[PDB]
């Protein structure tokens, strides 16, 4: 869990250094844990590995590590990939709920949000280097229910609940400074 | 059946919100040299019509949209008719304002082009009558309810 | 000699004033006062030829307890009487003025007092905005004067005969320049003062002012929001340097304030002078210790001391009887909440706590430390009506009960409570309870911002309201949103919360208008038109509801802005001092002084321990076969000994975050 | 009799509940007392001996309201699950349940005439209901926030309602609406009373009103705020003359005595204090329990009072 939620941004060397620091000091704290940990094999299975390899994805230690990171996310991620196949994967998988699109200069913001979450759909944004401010409250996934009408604070309009919703974000420039 | 009930409630809220927007939509009026009332917020009206049409078209693809299919079809037809009427009327207002500005500051234009001047005067009288009718009933539904509009 | 001093060092610092005075003494032949350890500026030229110090002219007044914290008439001190005299000398010749100095010195209050003490001059207070125009002055001239015709020419004169109408300029430097480095309003002022008139727009006819003057005041141009004034305008106006009052002025003024404050309790009148001495030496040592180089919000002014006096008086007003221990406990609480709440470093907070302890022991003898105060100094009006200290355990229990109520009321999200979050909640509560106190909560992302403020706003009856911004976001639409906000605040008499993040400050095109809103309530040039007419009719309808007859336009507008400044509360949330990308970069020190800064910081080790222990307690990870190590690497100094498996696990999680 | 004010301490304590108490009611026929709990349960206990008899559960959410009929043969209840349950006290069993609400119901009670039952919820909508049919026939709205408490007056032609928008509206129950507005309070309103039995003479004599033929000038009621203060509206425009201060926390309710001569109020300060309004001071302050008090109700015919707490403890004080 510490690796999944924490070491998603550091490179391989610093990530392994952090893991070895955690393991050594947790051993110093006298807590029972395995020594020969294979976290990638431990967090997934062969059928999903072959499914990933059949799908458009590379195959080495770091790529399968980030692949098992993508499978069990809790917050919606920001993938930094020169290839950019997460949009292909999400249109392959979640096409059953009529996914929609929203960006900066869309002439509908509150109307678009209320209609989209009203009849029910997932979302996906293209050209994610310029971030979408629509994604803030649904990114939070906060709940304010009025007795069957789920509403969040974005726009003067009201919304509903959609169960199928996955956000995949992209970044082509390897050297950018996102807002805090 | 909780998901089906939630979807039906969402569709009912969609229909209620669309009907409320149609009922509360009104045509803004702006004074034009104390002669008529040009429609204001044309870009806002066009954007609202496009947003409503896109929302209805995208909402006519869900699995639980068959409960209010007739209401959705009627709303889509009304939205399409209103959008076409607004698209015609925006061009009508722009061309009428252009013709009025062209023929107002020129006094010898009537002598140079008498048939064109008479046609422009007739079109201006028709536009003034239409503007008076729109000012009498500023509601969007009342304006669209005029026969032959 | 006196006027040469006040003309050649009249806008200079104190050390350079002393240097110019000693240079004048070196080169002069005029006799000068013989006292060596005093500057010449501290002396006065009376009607008689001989010198006489200003110290023999200052009174020692005693003000009522009704007006002890908001002295609209200022306490007459040496600087006050000196600047009053020079304002009189430069006002009797109709020359315009400008008073410059660091914020908090008292320039505007002394200017009001000195310019209102005489009945000849009528006062029209006016504030300059960034987007100000000469049309504002034209409107003021239309309202307060009239156009009369003489054979010599058109003359603008006040309606009140025999009264010299003085126009006020609260910020003569704040109007922004154009692309060509001029300010239109100050060029208009220069035209008036240099030609004796101007040209009317409607008639294109030359006019001539009869009984109009101008007076301005501003901050140094080195301030981020201030510009170098034009030399053509500056050729007329003299400049006066209003420095910070200094130790003698602070002791005199706030000894008078404490003498007028402590009249409620009759058995503590002997401690007023020790209290004055203790506060003034604590204030000056904190000012010497902390400067603006480490952080740009480390400004210390006597406005802090007046807020201190107001807080002490507000705490002591309901209480019938207090001991010296309770009095100095309230003093320490106000010192904490006005000084060490804004610090960034835990070392600095420890230094200030040790400073408070040292001040108390040095200037409050034969008083016990423990009975004098404790370490958890918390005051709240929730558990009890009276503003008496509440202890940590019962405070946490009451806040937990209110939080359980709040879970199913507005927001269903779990929260974990501890010492720092309780302190922050009480600080936020006291800032909302204080009228016009605008809160400015900054810290690391997360850490409870826009959650504690939302909770306190819900529990105090305020209606929360967030702000969203978009593309093609017209100033007209932002003014419409502000129309609804201002209507809800004033016309409907509903308190609102001005919650906004740094992401809503992407455009500086509306940043200046919330700056003027924080400055003086209302923002000029907003609502004009038929919407203006409808909102004034709504305002007069609300006036009928609240029970006053106001059919007059500008008085109705004044009542509206008074209601708004009464019931508008502001909370800012933004990251620490690393955001130089925006227009402010270093945000305005005037805005910092008007607001109050709370440093949230990051969660501490015990905070992480408790928020981890509370959340992990749902699962079962207890190991009865646990072995206690002979040397456990521990980061939480209050870990139970011997630690359990749950304690070891949460200590490991805290160490992972570290 | 008429001066039998409550006195400390309680003669009986009950700890058979598992959640906090919400409302306290009684019966007009027999000497049986009922209450509401936050765990979809109702507690029934006796006051002469202090022995519990039975419990009436069946709700789906926390019960937040309870009503008593003047005839003593009817009862009402409310819950956060948008359901109102009516039961018979003779058999201690439920009779019928009527839905219709859309949000969490705060309070619900039957009118003095018994023809229609008012309602209150977080959706700011009052829904009426029928007894024989069970279908909604009338409704009202207008509140800008959740309705706190609504109770009709003695005449039955006026109802006083308050919300969380710092505005309490008094409207005619029969046909009219929005008779007057009382927005002088600065905090959220929690509870308010309508009128006592022998209150007109007290208002005419003690308060600033006319003598003899006063003409019953509007409802004179206290409370309506939670910022440790109260506001009173007299007539027409609602002038403020009487303010009740002394509560250490938000107010919870207000009632009167059997003779209408003593004023008793409850709040969240974990203390039940009875203050004589003639002397404008507290007459006796007592600690109800170690936890915050949610509701209280003093018996009219019996010389005793009841109080509730969130610590699953109920105390019955003795009045002499
Ligand atoms: N001699 C004095 N007597 C009384 N109060 C004083 C004196 N000197 C300073 N003060 C106080 O110090 C503060 C001075 O702050 P400051 O001059 O910045 O504020 P201002 O007069 O409201 O306007 P501005 O911020 O434009 O200068 C005021 O709160 C004032 O009451
Ligand atoms: N003292 C606290 N204890 C537990 N959780 C907290 C605390 N303060 C904040 N949180 C959590 O932080 C989450 C996000 O709020 P936060 O990130 O602080 O807002 P902001 O991003 O404006 O700072 C909330 O869901 C809340 O549960």
Residue numbers in the entry:
A (entry chain A): 3511 to 3690
B (entry chain A): 1449 to 1597
C (entry chain A): 2495 to 3152
D (entry chain E): 91 to 410
Copy text verbatim from the article accompanying this structure deposition.
Cytoplasmic dynein-1 is a conserved, minus-end-directed microtubule motor critical for cell division and long-range intracellular transport in eukaryotic cells. Dynein, a member of the AAA + (ATPase associated with various cellular activities) family, forms a 1.4 MDa dimer composed of two copies each of heavy (HC), intermediate (IC), light intermediate (LIC), and three (TCTEX, LC8, and ROBL) light chains (LC), with the IC, LIC, and LC known as accessory chains. Cellular and structural studies have shown that dynein primarily exists in a pseudo-twofold symmetric, autoinhibited Phi state incompatible with movement along microtubules. LIS1 plays essential roles in the activation of dynein, including relieving autoinhibition and helping assemble the fully active DDA transport complexes.
To visualize the conformational landscape of dynein activation by LIS1, we incubated full-length human dynein with ATP and LIS1 at room temperature for 5 minutes. We identified three major species: individual dynein motors (Open), Phi, and a third state similar to Phi but with two LIS1 β-propellers bound to dynein, which we termed Pre-Chi. To fully understand dynein’s activation pathway, we began by analyzing particles corresponding to Open. We observed significant conformational and compositional heterogeneity in the Open species and used several approaches to sort out the coexisting subclasses. We obtained six different Open subclasses, which we categorized based on the linker conformation (bent, intermediate, or straight) and the presence or absence of LIS1. In monomeric dynein, LIS1 has been observed bound to both sitering and sitestalk, and to sitering in the absence of binding to sitestalk, but not to sitestalk only.
